[PDB]
Ligand binder design. Structure first.
Ligand SMILES: CC[C@H](C)CNC(=O)CP(=O)(O)[C@H](CC(C)C)NC(=O)[C@H](Cc1c[nH]c[nH+]1)NC(=O)[C@H](Cc1ccccc1)NC(=O)OC(C)(C)C
Length: 330
């Protein structure tokens, strides 16, 4: 079987993308943030502390005939930006773009941090990294992808995120009409539990490609592109009004400028991010200063190929026994 769902940016800046998910019987549609940097499927629900719920849509396990409480199981997760959530777990039918999985673990939030309450458009997250990062205790639960692998026509899922436009998430098949040229695959290390790979180098604008190993993770749940401080400094050195701003927290530049492109290597292939994808947007509505899409990963402790990077390509998350990552220009 296969599944195909449209994913849309939550705002005009492409801060995150939401994809509709059907949970329970009859189906309860929630808009989730598909995250390749985490492994938990959690949602706001009838159990979440009332005062911590904004206008998000909640899952009511009591209204679903197929919901089953997973006795004794609890969960607690903290993300890179400091947000967190926790609760109990239920198993229920979950469908994404026509692909249905039964007995999928749906983690019910009892409490959520301030940033989640504040984001009215995100109803929860759907983890797509390796099941080893799942926070359910005492026994970890499999991700939606791991549970679907048996029925998938092919153990794969593709990410085709749009630039200021909708995109698509497909499960079990590769849409040959969605990209140009051929897909180049690169090995993945599951040691840290992420979709971890090593880039072959980079190039700024129309300059020279520098062969240097860049170990990073493909994470659809992170907005920006975080690279080593020296590579980021080399990029910004090509933008005359750009500077590192301690108050804003990163490189900023005149919205006025035409940014050079940024190329990253995948084995022998090259993925080019258009300079405009690097212009995230004004620091404030009406400001003449814009926030850069490429920032230093020095403080994160790890390089992350976020949305700004991923949206410039067609990405294939190949989940076979020995997983691999494929990238194609589009
Ligand atoms: C089991 C623990 C796992 C290893 C946790 N995994 C992670 O924290 C990585 P993630 O991709 O799952 C996680 C998902 C988010 C929805 C919280 N992303 C993050 O934690 C990163 C912050 C970060 C990561 N690393 C260093 N800093 N968040 C982000 O990148 C958020 C995403 C977002 C935007 C808008 C609305 C909702 C969500 N965007 C963001 O911060 O954008 C600006 C930099 C412009 C402010």
């Amino acid at each position: 079987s296969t599944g195909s769902a449209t994913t849309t940016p939550i705002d005009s800046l492409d801060d995150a993308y939401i994809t509709p998910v059907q949970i329970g019987t009859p189906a309860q549609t929630l808009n989730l943030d598909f995250d390749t940097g985490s492994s938990d499927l959690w949602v706001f629900s009838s159990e979440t502390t009332a005062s911590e719920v904004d206008g998000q849509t909640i899952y009511t396990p009591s209204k679903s005939t197929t919901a089953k409480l997973l006795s004794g199981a609890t969960w607690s997760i903290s993300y890179g930006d400091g947000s967190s959530s926790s609760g109990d777990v239920y198993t229920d039918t979950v469908s994404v773009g026509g692909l249905t999985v039964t007995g999928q673990a749906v983690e019910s939030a009892k409490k959520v941090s301030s940033s989640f309450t504040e984001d009215s458009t995100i109803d929860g997250l759907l983890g797509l990294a390796f099941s080893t990062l799942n926070t359910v205790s005492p026994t970890q639960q499999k991700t939606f992808f791991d549970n679907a692998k048996a029925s998938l026509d092919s153990p794969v899922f593709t990410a085709d995120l749009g630039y200021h436009a909708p995109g698509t998430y497909n499960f079990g098949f590769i849409d040959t009409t969605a990209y140009t040229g051929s897909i180049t695959y690169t090995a993945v290390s599951t040691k840290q539990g992420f979709w971890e790979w090593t880039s072959t180098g980079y190039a700024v604008g129309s300059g020279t490609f520098k062969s240097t190993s860049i170990d990073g993770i493909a994470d659809t749940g992170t907005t920006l592109l975080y690279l080593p401080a020296t590579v980021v400094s080399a990029y910004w050195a090509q933008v005359s009004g750009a500077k590192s701003s301690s108050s804003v927290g990163g490189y900023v530049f005149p919205c006025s400028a035409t940014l050079p492109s940024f190329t990253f290597g995948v084995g022998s292939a090259r993925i080019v991010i258009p300079g405009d994808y690097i212009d995230f947007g004004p620091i404030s509505t009406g400001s003449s200063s814009c926030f850069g899409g490429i920032q230093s990963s020095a403080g994160i402790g790890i390089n992350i190929f976020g949305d700004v990077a991923l949206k410039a390509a067609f990405v294939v998350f190949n989940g076979a026994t020995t997983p691999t990552l494929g990238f194609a220009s589009k």
